[PDB]
Amino acid sequence: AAAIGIDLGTTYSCVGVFQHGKVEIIANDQGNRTTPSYVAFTDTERLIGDAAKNQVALNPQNTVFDAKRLIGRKFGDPVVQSDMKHWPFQVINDGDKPKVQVSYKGETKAFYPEEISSMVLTKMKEIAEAYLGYPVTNAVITVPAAFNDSQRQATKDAGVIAGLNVLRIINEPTAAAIAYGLDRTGKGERNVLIFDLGGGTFDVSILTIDDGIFEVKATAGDTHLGGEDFDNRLVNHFVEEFKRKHKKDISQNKRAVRRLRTACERAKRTLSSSTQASLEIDSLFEGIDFYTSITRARFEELCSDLFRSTLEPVEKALRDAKLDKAQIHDLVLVGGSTRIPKVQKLLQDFFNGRDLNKSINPDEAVAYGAAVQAAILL
Numbered sequence: 001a002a003a004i005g006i007d008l009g010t011t012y013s014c015v016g017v018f019q020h021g022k023v024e025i026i027a028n029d030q031g032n033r034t035t036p037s038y039v040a041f042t043d044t045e046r047l048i049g050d051a052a053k054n055q056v057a058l059n060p061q062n063t064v065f066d067a068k069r070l071i072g073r074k075f076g077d078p079v080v081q082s083d084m085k086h087w088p089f090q091v092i093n094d095g096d097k098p099k100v101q102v103s104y105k106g107e108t109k110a111f112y113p114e115e116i117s118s119m120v121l122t123k124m125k126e127i128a129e130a131y132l133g134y135p136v137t138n139a140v141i142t143v144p145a146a147f148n149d150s151q152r153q154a155t156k157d158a159g160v161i162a163g164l165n166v167l168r169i170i171n172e173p174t175a176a177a178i179a180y181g182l183d184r185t186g187k188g189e190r191n192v193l194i195f196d197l198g199g200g201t202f203d204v205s206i207l208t209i210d211d212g213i214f215e216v217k218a219t220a221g222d223t224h225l226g227g228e229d230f231d232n233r234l235v236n237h238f239v240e241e242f243k244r245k246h247k248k249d250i251s252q253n254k255r256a257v258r259r260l261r262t263a264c265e266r267a268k269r270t271l272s273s274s275t276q277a278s279l280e281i282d283s284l285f286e287g288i289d290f291y292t293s294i295t296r297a298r299f300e301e302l303c304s305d306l307f308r309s310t311l312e313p314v315e316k317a318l319r320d321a322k323l324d325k326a327q328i329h330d331l332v333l334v335g336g337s338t339r340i341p342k343v344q345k346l347l348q349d350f351f352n353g354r355d356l357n358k359s360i361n362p363d364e365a366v367a368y369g370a371a372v373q374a375a376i377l378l
C-alpha cells in the first residue's frame with residue numbers, strides 16, 4: 001500500500017507515487033500530469049479539475065479557484081479583503097471565517113476554503129487510485145514555506161476531509177530539494193536556491209542543508225506574479241490584433257476574453273518547446289473566427305519586464321542569506337513557468353552560466369519530492 005505525494009497548488013495540483021524504486025507522476029483521466037485546482041458547481045453536478053476549468057467561461061459565478069489564497073485565513077485578513085475584489089465568485093463572512101458562496105443543484109451553498117481544497121485533494125486521490133488499482137489512505141501534502149500554523153492546520157483538515165491520513169505537511173522548497181536528492185549527504189553545508197514561478201505566485205527560497213537537516217536562510221518573491229500574468233499580456237495583444245483586423249472590441253464580453261485566455265495559455269505552453277504557435281478560436285466574437293499565430297520572440301518581448309522582475313527577489317534573498325552567487329551549490333527550477341526558455345536564460349545568466357536542475361518537469365518537482373518523503377515516512 002503505497003503512500004502518495006500531493007502538491008496542492010494555487011493554480012494546478014499534482015500527485016506522484018514512489019513505487020518499485022522510482023517516482024511516477026500520475027496523469028489524470030485526460031492524460032494531464034497536473035490538474036487545475038478548480039471546483040465548479042452546476043444545476044446538476046460538481047466538477048473538479050479539468051472538467052471544472054474547461055467550463056469556467058460558461059459558469060464564472062460558480063467556478064471556484066484560488067482557494068489556497070483563502071485557506072486558514074480569517075475573513076478580516078487584509079489578504080482576503082484584497083483578493084476578493086477580483087474573483088467572480090462570492091466570498092462571505094461566517095464567524096470571521098471566509099466561505100465561498102455558490103449555487104449548486106438550484107440552491108445557495110457556502111463552503112470553507114478547506115472544503116474546496118478537500119475536493120481538489122479527492123480528485124488527486126482518485127487519480128492515484130485509478131493508476132495504482134487500490135484505495136490510497138496515506139499522503140504527504142506540501143505547503144508554501146510562508147504558511148502559518150492556521151494555514152497548515154486547514155490544509156491538513158482538507159486532507160482529512162478527503163479521507164487521507166496526512167503523514168506530514170512539508171514545505172514546497174524542501175520537497176523540491178528532496179526530489180533532486182539534495183539531502184542525502186552527511187556533514188557539510190550545501191546551499192540550495194529554489195526558484196519557483198508558478199501560475200499565480202513567485203517564490204525564491206535559499207536553503208542550507210547539513211546532514212539531512214534543512215534550514216531556511218532567506219525567502220523572497222511576489223504572491224501575484226506568475227504564468228497568469230504572462231497569459232494576460234498575450235490576451236491584451238490579441239485583443240488589439242482583433243480590433244485592428246475586424247474593428248470590433250471584444251474586451252467587455254466576459255466569455256470571449258475567457259476563451260481567448262484559454263487559447264493563450266495553450267499557445268504559451270507550445271512556445272516553450274517550439275518557436276511559433278497557432279491560435280484558432282472558432283466564433284470568438286459575433287461569429288467571427290480568430291485564426292492567427294505568435295512567435296516565441298514576440299511573446300518574450302510582450303513579457304520582457306515581467307520575466308526580468310524575477311531576478312530582484314533572487315538578489316534580495318542572496319543579500320538576506322549573506323551568500324554570494326558562487327556559494328549556491330544547486331539551482332532548482334520549480335513551477336510551470338520556469339519551463340519558459342527566456343526565464344531559464346535570465347536565471348542562468350544571472351548565475352554566470354551555472355547549471356539549472358530541470359530534469360524533473362518543474363511543475364511536478366514538488367509532488368515528486370513529496371512522494372519520496374511519503375515513502376521514507378512509511
Ligand SMILES: Nc1ncnc2c1ncn2[C@@H]1O[C@H](COP(=O)(O)OP(=O)(O)O)[C@@H](O)[C@H]1O
Pocket residue numbers: 009010011012013034197198199200201226227228265268269270272334335336337338339340362363
Ligand atoms: N510548458 C510550459 N511553458 C510555459 N508555461 C507553462 C508550461 N506548462 C505549464 N505552464 C504554466 O505553469 C503555470 C502553473 O504552474 P504549476 O507549478 O503547475 O502550478 P502552481 O502555480 O499552482 O504551483 C500555469 O501558468 C501554466 O500555464
Ligand SMILES: [Cl-]
Pocket residue numbers: 028029030049050127
Ligand atoms: Cl481526471
Ligand SMILES: [K+]
Pocket residue numbers: 007008009010012013014363
Ligand atoms: K502545483
Ligand SMILES: [Mg+2]
Pocket residue numbers: 009010198335366
Ligand atoms: Mg507551485
